[PDB]
Amino acid sequence: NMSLENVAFNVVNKGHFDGQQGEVPVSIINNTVYTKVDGVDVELFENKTTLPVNVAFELWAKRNIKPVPEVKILNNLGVDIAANTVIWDYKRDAPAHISTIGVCSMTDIAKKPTETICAPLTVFFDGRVDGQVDLFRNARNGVLITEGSVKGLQPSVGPKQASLNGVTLIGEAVKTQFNYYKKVDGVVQQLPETYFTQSRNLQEFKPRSQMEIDFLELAMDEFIERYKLEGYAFEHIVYGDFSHSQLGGLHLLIGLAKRFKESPFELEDFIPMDSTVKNYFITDAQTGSSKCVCSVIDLLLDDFVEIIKSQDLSVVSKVVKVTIDYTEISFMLWCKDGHVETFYPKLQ
Amino acid sequence: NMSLENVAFNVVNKGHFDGQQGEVPVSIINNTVYTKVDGVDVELFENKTTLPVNVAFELWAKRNIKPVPEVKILNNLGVDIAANTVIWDYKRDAPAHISTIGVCSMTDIAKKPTETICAPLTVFFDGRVDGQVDLFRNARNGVLITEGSVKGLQPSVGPKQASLNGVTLIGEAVKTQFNYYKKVDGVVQQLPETYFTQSRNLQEFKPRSQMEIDFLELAMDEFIERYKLEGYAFEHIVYGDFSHSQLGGLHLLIGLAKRFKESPFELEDFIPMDSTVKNYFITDAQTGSSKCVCSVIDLLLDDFVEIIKSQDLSVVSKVVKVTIDYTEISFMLWCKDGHVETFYPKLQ
Amino acid sequence: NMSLENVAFNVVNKGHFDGQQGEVPVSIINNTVYTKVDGVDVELFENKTTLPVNVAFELWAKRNIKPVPEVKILNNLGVDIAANTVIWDYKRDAPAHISTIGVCSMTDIAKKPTETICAPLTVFFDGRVDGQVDLFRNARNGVLITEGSVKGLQPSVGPKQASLNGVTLIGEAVKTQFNYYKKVDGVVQQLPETYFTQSRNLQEFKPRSQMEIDFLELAMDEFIERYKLEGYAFEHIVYGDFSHSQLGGLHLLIGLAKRFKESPFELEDFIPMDSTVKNYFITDAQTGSSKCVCSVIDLLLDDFVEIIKSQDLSVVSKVVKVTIDYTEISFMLWCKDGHVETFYPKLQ
Amino acid sequence: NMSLENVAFNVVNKGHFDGQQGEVPVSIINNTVYTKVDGVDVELFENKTTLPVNVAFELWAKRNIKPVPEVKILNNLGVDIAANTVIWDYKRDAPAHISTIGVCSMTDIAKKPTETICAPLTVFFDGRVDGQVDLFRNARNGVLITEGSVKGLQPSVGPKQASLNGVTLIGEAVKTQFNYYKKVDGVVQQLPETYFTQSRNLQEFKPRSQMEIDFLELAMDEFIERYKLEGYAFEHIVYGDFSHSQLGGLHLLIGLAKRFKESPFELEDFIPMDSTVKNYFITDAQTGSSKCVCSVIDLLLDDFVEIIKSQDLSVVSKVVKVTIDYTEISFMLWCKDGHVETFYPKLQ
Amino acid sequence: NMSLENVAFNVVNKGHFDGQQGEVPVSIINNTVYTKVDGVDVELFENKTTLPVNVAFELWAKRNIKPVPEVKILNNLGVDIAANTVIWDYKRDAPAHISTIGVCSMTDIAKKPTETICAPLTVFFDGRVDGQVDLFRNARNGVLITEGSVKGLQPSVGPKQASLNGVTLIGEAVKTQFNYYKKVDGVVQQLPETYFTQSRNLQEFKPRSQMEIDFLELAMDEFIERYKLEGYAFEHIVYGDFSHSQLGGLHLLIGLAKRFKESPFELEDFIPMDSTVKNYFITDAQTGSSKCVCSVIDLLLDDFVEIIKSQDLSVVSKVVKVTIDYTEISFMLWCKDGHVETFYPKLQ
Ligand SMILES: O=c1ccn([C@@H]2O[C@H](COP(=O)(O)O)[C@@H](O)[C@H]2O)c(=O)[nH]1
Ligand SMILES: O=c1ccn([C@@H]2O[C@H](COP(=O)(O)O)[C@@H](O)[C@H]2O)c(=O)[nH]1
Ligand SMILES: O=c1ccn([C@@H]2O[C@H](COP(=O)(O)O)[C@@H](O)[C@H]2O)c(=O)[nH]1
Ligand SMILES: O=c1ccn([C@@H]2O[C@H](COP(=O)(O)O)[C@@H](O)[C@H]2O)c(=O)[nH]1
Ligand SMILES: O=c1ccn([C@@H]2O[C@H](COP(=O)(O)O)[C@@H](O)[C@H]2O)c(=O)[nH]1
Fold first, then answer.
1. Residue C304: helix, strand or coil by DSSP?
2. Fewest beta carbons within 10 Å, which of B297, C175, C331, C342?
């Protein structure tokens, strides 16, 4: 007895779809789902997706409510579709994937990932669910996460954090650290050695190393002195330069965090999705310095220092590829006379 | 178990709601309901009501598919709601009544007409359905139709025609002639003597008496002579006067029918609902004669002749009351020197 | 360079997309596309699909404007997608296929049908377009039409009619008769022997054999006598029985055509798509006889006579399979004492 | 001269409907009302209700702007409709009641509450308005609030707080403490002895007793020691248990307030309306502990202590009914060996 | 190659329209623009204007991204339209002006401001753009801003602050202080001597003089003593009176700022646009004091003191006109016995 009214019954009574029997009366108006409570309509769901309102509602109700990989990781690994779950993209307020497998009769392309239609697609498999490791072994294309070893398969250790109901966190009551595995055209594929972004935000930014603690606490000249960063242009890249009409540098989230605590600024997120590199149209409220495309990455400051200090500074300009969140991020490196002028990640 | 997808299943497989088990995939977009058939969306219902699309869809699917009284009759008798059915108003493409009894969870005010909330409402009961005659005997306010006698109740003979799936017809394979009964505050009413409108349309107008055959076949002066109608202004009232910029008369549907077969004209139906008197903004294509409010009634011509020949003609102008379709219709009667000048029904 | 404004320019100047350079100003509102002509907005396209309005507009403008197979034929042959064209489904006012190849950036899954993603799909190829016969020879799954012989392939002769801009016709100035070929998993199929429906309509029904001329001209008993059809229940199946509240029979379009020219009736097309068998909720205006699901097929009368005269009549009821428009249509055959009682196609 | 343009004139000039004469030009687009100011459109109202945009606008403009009972109190007392005012529900951004009396021609069921249609409805009456106490005495069903005694009527003292323009507050410049009276089927009905919720929110939470001050200030073990709460499971019920994947307890708002000041968490309000018990899908950001249905009530901590300490702890599990905000709230009581395991309110 | 897809390419790649070549696929659904990124739709723009979605998107993408005059200044100077730019109104989330010149083919009334259609309109010209000073000299009606002197033209020094991407700021890395010039019917027009509002907001309010520092820091009686404000009713006008049900005074933003830091309140901005005087429906959360129309102006406190101390206090009531932001603001002045009772700006 699968139906719109049953999905709404579960939302009202269990907070999400829980397979319980029951029905409530529902009204659909434009892109919103309502239910009647004691004679009046109460909004249950406002559709912000490009799917029909009643379909989006069901996929949202059926969203995965355990820690799952952040969407940027799944995108970077080429995931097209999930096996028997919905990965909800809270940055876009929409399903991470257009089609489903065994979830919803309007969006399903199959009931099980073993069906031939799924073979060309990179299917996401969750080893925490019974049977899905074995489905991955039979799939032609897929990405698998597990909490432990899988016999014979060589793992890649994933990021420490995961997404739980749209909250990115490092789990203490739950496990958010997964092993990752990937298959392409029937062959298990070695995942590259990689850095991971830290998935923090401006307001609640917390340092995760003594170097980041020092960066937030010390003055610019003292931090650069203590960590021996002369000639690496941190004044520009990390602290940002607000003296000209065009804003200089400011490409590390921690540097935005330091500035924000002292002086507010505006960030227009003109491509609002989850991605390893984020691009903002930034306007500094105190000075009027601004920049249309300011690429910002949230690396651990120790990792960025490691990355920049390993570069050859003898070329005027080159593109440097660094593996981050399993993808190749291009950095622009500008040097003059053996010193860095700038070093910044580019719009993906 | 009631459900949007089950309603759609019945529409696709049975043509309407038939209580069958099953489900089909449904999409709701732009006030329209779609179902997926072999990978593509097929429109099942476009909402033209002021109700939510999924609610209107369910009421439409649950519409009564037997011959039922035309909505104008039910309105004239003061019907507020129907017992355990939906009277679909095909002139408005919407339910004839705002609420339901035992039909739909979003619109129901009760499951049975015996509930207290129904006592003050005038409930429509259908004697063809088992138990409904006795429900009428117990109800405080109600209208009852039957096909035959009811013990201890005097009937009022209704019109010959009824509505079947939006087609108004005099039934030959099905009975469309009902007895009518009405109760107000527990008291059986004596319904008034009444004429009935004939519910015909322009393009397929069919005469229903020898006088109407003669009207369509004969020239104007031949007809007026044969039925001795000199001095009743039929030339104006029934045939129409297209000689001046304002169109004179033309208040009987048969007169429009006669003109239409020879010469086309435009009728703007600016209040599009079912009613005993209809008002049109008429523009005559041949002459350019037009009129903003032309009230038009489809009485059998013999009945209209009886009415106008039964009036006193000694006063310049007065209001004449005629019970038609059980309601009192006001006509304006204008006379000069003992003859009719015009006689027309008024917008109710 | 593809563009909304360039699509509109072609529609305004060429009647459809013709690859011409230019732009016009465009407004998008209420699922409708407008263009500005001398200071006022003129509607160019109203979206009736479940796609975004600007995407539906582009696919409509790029529709195939040569004679093409009717959508029911393509559906019956399992076609999923078209090579480098859009088959517009005029019954649904929408694209016949969800995805495209080399047509439109929002809906394309590939630029050429040789890409790997197309291998499992049944691709429609048009031998009138240069190169497409050879694309079919290399494709894994496909349907091919041609106007003449293809070296080394046995053809299946298709119907006489095809669809040109939504008009189904037997071409006189253009060829509408195609050879058909089909491949499944790289293997050329032998297409089955099949009847074809005639794709006619009620108001303009034209007989296509002497038997059909006789059916329309002669009275019922004269016709049944002349073609010796006693005992095949044509009175019920083809002519229809309007004597009871439920309408009996009336399963052949020619029988509806004959009734319609004498007496009007209403057909509610409750699944409005192109299909070999059509299902209507029918209400006869003269009698009030009606039926919720009346399955109707337009076979040449001679073909229907051959089919029913080729059945064993010794069992009360059974399912009869008839290949029509390349698909297996199930008919219900009911018999009594060695004669037909009824014989009707089922909702597919 | 009541009209859309006059309602907008009052909104623009007086901040709400004030019965002033005048008109401004208005544009309606989708669900939004605009007015022209110096050549450009300015948004006056965005419709979030299920009513037509222009109707919702008028009811909003006509909202009651004096302190009124919170909607949860009116709901708990069975109020269906208000006499000659609109109680705006700021939690739902919509009218608290679907119909009106003497407010708006699209929603009125009557002009005065004495009309027979209002007799079955529980009408809300405001003794601050001239004549409404006497209307309550004549009403068959109703709820009355006053600021002082009504002769012969036995009062119930209401909550200290009321809602003023969506701000819940205990009035100092205005009176927010009302006497309550209720009638059912013509008979005055004794309102039950009741606790009241405190209607506070997480961010601005202020303690209202020394015990609440101590709870916010002291550590868990010290507070439980000082107020002798051993064996009543406050560690679970009030402080919450974040050590397992499922979040334990956390059912009092003050406990959420204490946690929030130290560590943020996410509350999905999946039924967003005013109610005595609120239910949240909660995710703790620090630990990853979460729970789909966490029922939360804002009682004065002294009241909850009084409630739980009066319970019999000798049964493994029972349902305990407590009157709160005039309604029966069900609590689940789990005990083991004479101590509380948990005690929590259930989803209404 | 100007098109919807090209506008979207620029937004995605450059943060705004930058005249770059390229295209991305775009979906329009209701009032929102999406683009496809790696198989899924990402929202680029939600239309809150009364223009068609695709037009509003292009004007937004083409918005001026240098410091520009606040919209209230342009409105006060009678500006109808801008020369070859779009002034985006971030308070209304819409273009400041309905038509354009050389921006967008759907909204342009001309390509250049020299065209005859522009002569009756007050065109905004930006002396920072090559050629626009000379266009102003040739225009019949216009407003010009420059950073420096224009030969022979007598300047008006504008406000210190300007709007950069919706951020109002006094520029340090950029110039926000302009000279202003205006022409009416071909004649340069002397701009009046004027005060300027300070364009601050409640949360981030920063004092801009020692008097404002003292007002925020000192107690009411001490501030009034130090600055000799006895008899000017500052207790009412600036500090506000919260003792009665109607809120008294509170007409200077700095006084709202002082109250807000101590006790929160609600401001309903019922005409949400940029204007020299703002009007709020205010509800004080601590007391319940409220007022439907509370007019609030953000003058430097020193300027307001200068204004009020120059008034003649010998009349019971008069209207006082003060030039502010180049417009005449009407103040109500009430006096009794040579002292101010109140002095407040009126709804523009
Ligand atoms: O993808 C990009 C392109 C540019 N920039 C910023 O914009 C500046 C100027 O870019 P360009 O004009 O040299 O391309 C760069 O130095 C850098 O700060 C980014 O952050 N990301
Ligand atoms: O309800 C109305 C009012 C007017 N008329 C037509 O309009 C003419 C002029 O009406 P009046 O302008 O004299 O009211 C009438 O003679 C009659 O033909 C109607 O048909 N119905
Ligand atoms: O798919 C169907 C089912 C039924 N019928 C019509 O409805 C009658 C009654 O069907 P049933 O109620 O016996 O299934 C049949 O004899 C036939 O005329 C159809 O045309 N198509
Ligand atoms: O209406 C409900 C149901 C459950 N719970 C919480 O969920 C836990 C587990 O519920 P159940 O799985 O025992 O029903 C309860 O102990 C309680 O913390 C609520 O807060 N409210
Ligand atoms: O445009 C207006 C009108 C009134 N008021 C406030 O409302 C009070 C009462 O206004 P009235 O009822 O005297 O018009 C005024 O003293 C003033 O505080 C304003 O702020 N702005």
1. helix
2. C175
D25/D152 same-domain check: no
DSSP symbols for A101-155:
ESS-TTTEEESSTTSGGGTTS-EEEETTSTTHHHHHHH-SSEEEEESS--TTPPP
Q: Are residues E96 and E151 in the same domain?
A: yes
Contact call for residues C6 and C26 (beta carbons, < 8 A):
no
Strand-by-strand arrangement of the A278-284 sheet: A265-268, A278-284, A290-296
Measured in whole angstroms, how far is the alpha carbon of residue A63 from the centre of its chain? 16
Give the CATH number for residue C141.
3.40.50.11580
Residue-wise burial string across A153-175, b where 16 or more C-beta atoms lie within 10 A, e elsewhere: eebbebbebbbbbebbbbbebbe
Of B284, B289, B294, B348, the one to substitute when testing ligand 2's pocket (max ligand atoms within 8 A of C-beta) is: B294
In three-state secondary structure terms, A99 is coil
In this structure, are E101 and E209 located in the same domain? no
Neighbours of chain C (3+ CB pairs under 8 A): A, B, E
Query: What CATH number does the domain containing D60 carry?
Result: 3.30.160.820
Tokens at residue A31, please? Answer: 């892109």
Determine the number of helices (DSSP H) and then strands (DSSP E) in chain B: 9, 21
CA D78 to chain centre: 13
Same structural domain for residues C96 and C218? no
Half-sphere exposure of D289 (CA within 13 A, CB side): 16
This structure's resolution (angstroms)? 1.8
Residues 6+ apart with CB under 8 A from C295: C251, C277, C278, C279, C344, C345, C346, C347
How far apart CA A59 and CA A98 sit, in angstroms, is: 10
Residue type, C253: L
Closest alpha carbon within chain B to D50: B52
Are A138 and A58 in a shared domain? no
Residues of D in contact with E75 (CB under 8 A): 38
Of C152, C170, C191, the one marking the end of a domain is C191
Last residue of one domain, picked from the residues C22, C40, C65: C65
Cα–Cα separations (whole angstroms), residue A4 to A213, B23, C193, D113, E71: 51, 11, 44, 38, 47
The rounded distance, in Å, linking the Cα atoms of E8 and E24 is 6
Nearest-angstrom CA–CA distance, A347 and E37 = 13
Same domain, B73 and B59: no
Give the sign of the dihedral formed by CA E156, CA E157, CA E159, CA E161: positive
d(CA A60, CA A75): 19
Main-chain dihedrals φ then ψ at residue A255, nearest 5 degrees: -70, -35
Residue that has been written with the tokens 């350079």 in this structure: C21
D226 and D92 together in one domain: no
Comparing CA positions, the residue from E25, E8, B38 lying closest to residue C108 is E25
Q: What is D9-76 written as a DSSP string?
A: HHHHHHSS---------EEEETTEEEEEETTEEEEEEE--SSS-HHHHHHHHHTB--S-B--HHHHHH
Same domain, D9 and D132: no
Q: In this complex, is the C-beta atom of D186 within 8 Å of any C-beta atom belonging to chain B?
A: no
Query: Distance of alpha carbon C133 from its chain centroid, rounded?
Result: 24
Q: For ligand 1, is residue A346 a contact (CB within 6 Å)?
A: yes
Domain that holds residue C99: 66-191
Kindly state the DSSP code that residue E234 receives in the 8-state scheme. H
Rounded to the nearest angstrom, the minimum Cα separation between C150 and chain B is 31
Cβ atoms D28, D54 nearer than 8 A: yes
Q: What is the dihedral of CA D98, D104, D109, D111, to 10 degrees?
A: 140
Q: With contacts defined as CB-CB under 8 Å, which chain A residues touch E13?
A: 293, 347
d(C-alpha A224, C-alpha A247), whole Å: 21
In order of D319, D330, D346, the CA distances from D334 in angstroms are 9, 13, 13
A50–E34: do the CB atoms touch at under 8 Å?
Answer: yes
CB contact E20 to C (< 8 Å)? no
User: Determined by which method?
Assistant: X-ray
Number of separate domains in chain B: 3
